[PDB]
Design brief:
The structure is cut from a larger assembly and holds chains A (52 residues) and B (111 residues). Chain A is 0% helix and 37% strand. Chain A contains no helices and 2 strands. With 52 residues, chain A is an all-beta fold. Chain B is an all-alpha fold. Chain B has one domain: Up-down Bundle (Four Helix Bundle (Hemerythrin (Met), subunit A)), CATH 1.20.120. In chain B, helix 1 crosses helix 4. Classes of the chains: A mainly beta (52), B mainly alpha (111). At the A-B interface, loops of A face helix 1 of B. Chain B binds one DNA strand of 24 nucleotides through helix 4. Chain A: DNA-dependent RNA polymerase catalyzes the transcription of DNA into RNA using the four ribonucleoside triphosphates as substrates. Chain A: This is DNA-directed RNA polymerase subunit beta'.
Chain lengths: 52, 111
Amino acid sequence: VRAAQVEAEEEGETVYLTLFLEWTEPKDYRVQPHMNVVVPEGARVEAGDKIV
Amino acid sequence: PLLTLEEEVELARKVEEGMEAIKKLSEITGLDPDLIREVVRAKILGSARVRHIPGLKETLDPKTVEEIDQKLKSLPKEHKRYLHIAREGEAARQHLIEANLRLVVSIAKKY
DNA sequence: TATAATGGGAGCTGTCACGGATGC
């Protein structure tokens, strides 16, 4: 996970960091022999696009 | 060599989808589906074999298959995509046949 | 028309002798 932007606020003897983060979470999908992938390597998808 | 369940299902599937694509390409171009199939088959196998087909209403020589292949290549992307589908289906057909050529022997030895 | 099946089987054994085309 990467910190795109970093806003800070001073308050008393501390800072409070409002971090604009960006990061990728994995999910696995098991393929069966009767199935076929419709997507290449490293290809981006959206909500509702067909993988297999 | 013989087909893995995956390789078999894949070649099968591609065949069915190329048949579908020839149907769709007939819908699009208004040409005869059999003529379409023979043209795709011509270019798949090569010029080594092109010959007159009895059901075809037209004599299938390199001149007219070049003409029809050209009028096929003159398609939009989402239509010419069906030409690529049919080509892949023909090649899957030849590979699946040649794969199962040994079943035939094992079956005819009993005849 | 739909479990799944995936490379075959004989062979035939005792002539003799040439000419003429093909390999170390």
